[PDB]
Design an enzyme around this catalytic site. Sequence first.
Site, PDB file in Angstrom:
ATOM      1  N   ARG A  79      -2.331  -1.073  -9.251  1.00 40.07           N
ATOM      2  CA  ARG A  79      -3.414  -1.764  -8.555  1.00 40.07           C
ATOM      3  C   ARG A  79      -4.639  -1.993  -9.440  1.00 40.07           C
ATOM      4  O   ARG A  79      -5.298  -3.026  -9.333  1.00 40.07           O
ATOM      5  CB  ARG A  79      -3.818  -0.987  -7.303  1.00 40.07           C
ATOM      6  CG  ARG A  79      -4.826  -1.722  -6.439  1.00 40.07           C
ATOM      7  CD  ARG A  79      -5.322  -0.851  -5.302  1.00 40.07           C
ATOM      8  NE  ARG A  79      -6.101  -1.614  -4.330  1.00 40.07           N
ATOM      9  CZ  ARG A  79      -7.209  -1.165  -3.747  1.00 40.07           C
ATOM     10  NH1 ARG A  79      -7.668   0.042  -4.038  1.00 40.07           N
ATOM     11  NH2 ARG A  79      -7.862  -1.924  -2.880  1.00 40.07           N
ATOM     12  N   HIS A  89      -6.437  -5.636 -10.202  1.00 39.81           N
ATOM     13  CA  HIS A  89      -7.859  -5.891 -10.012  1.00 39.81           C
ATOM     14  C   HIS A  89      -8.580  -6.201 -11.313  1.00 39.81           C
ATOM     15  O   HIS A  89      -9.666  -6.778 -11.306  1.00 39.81           O
ATOM     16  CB  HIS A  89      -8.507  -4.716  -9.281  1.00 39.81           C
ATOM     17  CG  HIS A  89      -8.298  -4.760  -7.798  1.00 39.81           C
ATOM     18  ND1 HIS A  89      -8.993  -3.956  -6.919  1.00 39.81           N
ATOM     19  CD2 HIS A  89      -7.465  -5.513  -7.042  1.00 39.81           C
ATOM     20  CE1 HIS A  89      -8.597  -4.213  -5.685  1.00 39.81           C
ATOM     21  NE2 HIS A  89      -7.671  -5.153  -5.730  1.00 39.81           N
ATOM     22  N   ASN A 111     -12.920  -2.294  -4.286  1.00 36.73           N
ATOM     23  CA  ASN A 111     -12.843  -1.251  -5.304  1.00 36.73           C
ATOM     24  C   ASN A 111     -13.583   0.000  -4.843  1.00 36.73           C
ATOM     25  O   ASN A 111     -13.072   1.112  -4.972  1.00 36.73           O
ATOM     26  CB  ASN A 111     -13.450  -1.740  -6.620  1.00 36.73           C
ATOM     27  CG  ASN A 111     -12.496  -2.613  -7.403  1.00 36.73           C
ATOM     28  OD1 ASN A 111     -11.278  -2.512  -7.247  1.00 36.73           O
ATOM     29  ND2 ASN A 111     -13.041  -3.484  -8.248  1.00 36.73           N
ATOM     30  N   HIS A 171       3.221  -3.656  -2.793  1.00 39.31           N
ATOM     31  CA  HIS A 171       2.965  -2.853  -1.605  1.00 39.31           C
ATOM     32  C   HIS A 171       4.240  -2.155  -1.171  1.00 39.31           C
ATOM     33  O   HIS A 171       4.380  -1.771  -0.008  1.00 39.31           O
ATOM     34  CB  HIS A 171       2.455  -3.724  -0.460  1.00 39.31           C
ATOM     35  CG  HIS A 171       1.022  -4.160  -0.639  1.00 39.31           C
ATOM     36  ND1 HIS A 171       0.472  -5.185   0.110  1.00 39.31           N
ATOM     37  CD2 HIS A 171       0.100  -3.671  -1.563  1.00 39.31           C
ATOM     38  CE1 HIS A 171      -0.777  -5.303  -0.350  1.00 39.31           C
ATOM     39  NE2 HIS A 171      -1.027  -4.470  -1.312  1.00 39.31           N
TER      40      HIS A 171
HETATM   41  C1  HEM Z   1      -2.021 -10.583  -1.723  1.00 36.90           C
HETATM   42  C2  HEM Z   1      -3.308  -9.939  -1.638  1.00 36.90           C
HETATM   43  C3  HEM Z   1      -3.522  -8.552  -1.573  1.00 36.90           C
HETATM   44  C4  HEM Z   1      -4.313  -7.928  -0.644  1.00 36.90           C
HETATM   45  C5  HEM Z   1      -5.103  -8.600   0.476  1.00 36.90           C
HETATM   46  C6  HEM Z   1      -4.257  -6.500  -0.914  1.00 36.90           C
HETATM   47  C7  HEM Z   1      -4.895  -5.533  -0.156  1.00 36.90           C
HETATM   48  C8  HEM Z   1      -4.784  -4.155  -0.367  1.00 36.90           C
HETATM   49  C9  HEM Z   1      -5.450  -3.159   0.458  1.00 36.90           C
HETATM   50  C10 HEM Z   1      -6.275  -3.416   1.711  1.00 36.90           C
HETATM   51  C11 HEM Z   1      -5.120  -1.953  -0.060  1.00 36.90           C
HETATM   52  C12 HEM Z   1      -5.577  -0.612   0.485  1.00 36.90           C
HETATM   53  C13 HEM Z   1      -6.849  -0.105  -0.185  1.00 36.90           C
HETATM   54  C14 HEM Z   1      -7.332   1.205   0.402  1.00 36.90           C
HETATM   55  O1  HEM Z   1      -6.834   1.600   1.477  1.00 36.90           O
HETATM   56  O2  HEM Z   1      -8.207   1.843  -0.214  1.00 36.90           O
HETATM   57  C15 HEM Z   1      -4.236  -2.185  -1.209  1.00 36.90           C
HETATM   58  C16 HEM Z   1      -3.631  -1.172  -1.955  1.00 36.90           C
HETATM   59  C17 HEM Z   1      -2.661  -1.391  -2.936  1.00 36.90           C
HETATM   60  N1  HEM Z   1      -2.289  -2.655  -3.420  1.00 36.90           N
HETATM   61 FE1  HEM Z   1      -2.782  -4.453  -2.649  1.00 36.90          FE
HETATM   62  N2  HEM Z   1      -3.408  -6.225  -1.983  1.00 36.90           N
HETATM   63  C18 HEM Z   1      -3.007  -7.482  -2.441  1.00 36.90           C
HETATM   64  C19 HEM Z   1      -2.234  -7.674  -3.584  1.00 36.90           C
HETATM   65  C20 HEM Z   1      -1.721  -6.677  -4.405  1.00 36.90           C
HETATM   66  C21 HEM Z   1      -1.001  -6.936  -5.656  1.00 36.90           C
HETATM   67  C22 HEM Z   1      -0.755  -8.327  -6.246  1.00 36.90           C
HETATM   68  C23 HEM Z   1      -0.635  -5.725  -6.183  1.00 36.90           C
HETATM   69  C24 HEM Z   1       0.031  -5.434  -7.396  1.00 36.90           C
HETATM   70  C25 HEM Z   1       1.088  -6.212  -7.999  1.00 36.90           C
HETATM   71  C26 HEM Z   1      -1.137  -4.723  -5.228  1.00 36.90           C
HETATM   72  C27 HEM Z   1      -0.892  -3.345  -5.347  1.00 36.90           C
HETATM   73  C28 HEM Z   1      -1.403  -2.379  -4.485  1.00 36.90           C
HETATM   74  C29 HEM Z   1      -1.065  -0.955  -4.533  1.00 36.90           C
HETATM   75  C30 HEM Z   1       0.049  -0.334  -5.383  1.00 36.90           C
HETATM   76  C31 HEM Z   1      -1.869  -0.337  -3.597  1.00 36.90           C
HETATM   77  C32 HEM Z   1      -1.976   1.156  -3.302  1.00 36.90           C
HETATM   78  C33 HEM Z   1      -2.948   1.818  -4.265  1.00 36.90           C
HETATM   79  C34 HEM Z   1      -3.062   3.320  -4.064  1.00 36.90           C
HETATM   80  O3  HEM Z   1      -2.288   3.885  -3.261  1.00 36.90           O
HETATM   81  O4  HEM Z   1      -3.933   3.932  -4.714  1.00 36.90           O
HETATM   82  N3  HEM Z   1      -1.839  -5.327  -4.166  1.00 36.90           N
HETATM   83  N4  HEM Z   1      -3.998  -3.554  -1.368  1.00 36.90           N
HETATM   84  O1  LIG Z   2      -7.183  -4.723  -2.531  1.00 39.43           O
HETATM   85  C1  LIG Z   2      -7.981  -5.710  -2.252  1.00 39.43           C
HETATM   86  N1  LIG Z   2      -7.853  -6.851  -2.832  1.00 39.43           N
HETATM   87  O2  LIG Z   2      -6.821  -7.038  -3.782  1.00 39.43           O
HETATM   88  C2  LIG Z   2      -8.998  -5.496  -1.194  1.00 39.43           C
HETATM   89  C3  LIG Z   2      -9.064  -4.254  -0.497  1.00 39.43           C
HETATM   90  C4  LIG Z   2      -9.910  -4.142   0.613  1.00 39.43           C
HETATM   91  C5  LIG Z   2     -10.892  -5.117   0.854  1.00 39.43           C
HETATM   92  C6  LIG Z   2     -10.938  -6.280   0.076  1.00 39.43           C
HETATM   93  C7  LIG Z   2      -9.947  -6.525  -0.886  1.00 39.43           C
HETATM   94 CA   LIG Z   3     -11.049  -8.114 -15.689  1.00 40.43          CA
END
Ligand code: HEM
Ligand SMILES: O=C(NO)c1ccccc1
Ligand SMILES: [Ca+2]
Length: 308
Positions: A39, A43, A71, A171
Amino acid sequence: MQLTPTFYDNSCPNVSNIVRDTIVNELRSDPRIAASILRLHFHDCFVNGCDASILLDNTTSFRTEKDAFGNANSARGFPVIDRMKAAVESACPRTVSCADLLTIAAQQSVTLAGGPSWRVPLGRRDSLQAFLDLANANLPAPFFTLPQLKDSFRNVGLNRSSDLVALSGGHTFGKNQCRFIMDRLYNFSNTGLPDPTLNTTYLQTLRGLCPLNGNLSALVDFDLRTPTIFDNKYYVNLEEQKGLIQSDQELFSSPNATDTIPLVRSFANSTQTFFNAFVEAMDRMGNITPLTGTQGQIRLNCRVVNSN
Ligand code: HEM
Ligand SMILES: O=C(NO)c1ccccc1
Ligand SMILES: [Ca+2]
Ligand SMILES: [Ca+2]
């Protein structure tokens, strides 16, 4: 110049192993680190390219991206990246950029979690500043509609539907805070009712984990089938209306998902197909406006710009 997977084959041949060993050790005490690291790379890349700008700490000249919406109180694993950099600097002083380190760390994290294995193109350099305002505008939000998710990716050069569907597969592991799904659970779109695209039985399980007046910081697994294994189970969940966040389920249930549904069905029924698409999308993401050759620098400490 173009990025190449052979960039450190002569200057720091074992950088890959040093990175892997660090993650392996960390996984022992923190099984979530692999997800967190992938992640961090995502970002990084979406804000001014994969230039390690997200790793910079706050300064008097610019604000850290660590404070950005998405973040703040969300991103993690920074000290692990520090340990990685310290180990690499001892073996190959001033050779490997933080931007490249984070890229290798992300790939290794995916492989260590059971995902595909591949050599990432390298040769990126580190930025001289962080971009908070840009991060606040470039990172996609969980409440975005499908067309908005598509615009967000196209904005940085990932204009293929496969880029969106394949990368969303990240995810397949990791955690999500209750706060990001509260609306889907109790009051979606100011309707006072839950999201109709969320499986009703699953809705009950989620409401138990995220009670109305409960802890909004409580964590929920993104993938209810294999929470920590990098596989295609994420897509199977979508077919059953069990995608955790709004942006997840829209890939399958949105009225604009005409072009994403086939990819979802394809990925849900073929690990090999998903893995191939994921590697291709990852390399495309890793190629977003990188600093190369003479631009940027090779940061000695990922948290700060080099003095001189
Ligand atoms: C399509 C748009 C995307 C949205 C709206 C999104 C949104 C989110 C959100 C809301 C979280 C939870 C954050 C938290 O609870 O603190 C998250 C976590 C995560 N996302 Fe996404 N995400 C997106 C794309 C991606 C992409 C492209 C990847 C990587 C290829 C990714 C990998 C991850 C991972 C692995 C986690 C968990 C991180 C952890 O457990 O520390 N995300 N994402
Ligand atoms: O993970 C995110 N974007 O990739 C995200 C997480 C929470 C709020 C806004 C954006
Ligand atoms: Ca950068
Ligand atoms: Ca999984």
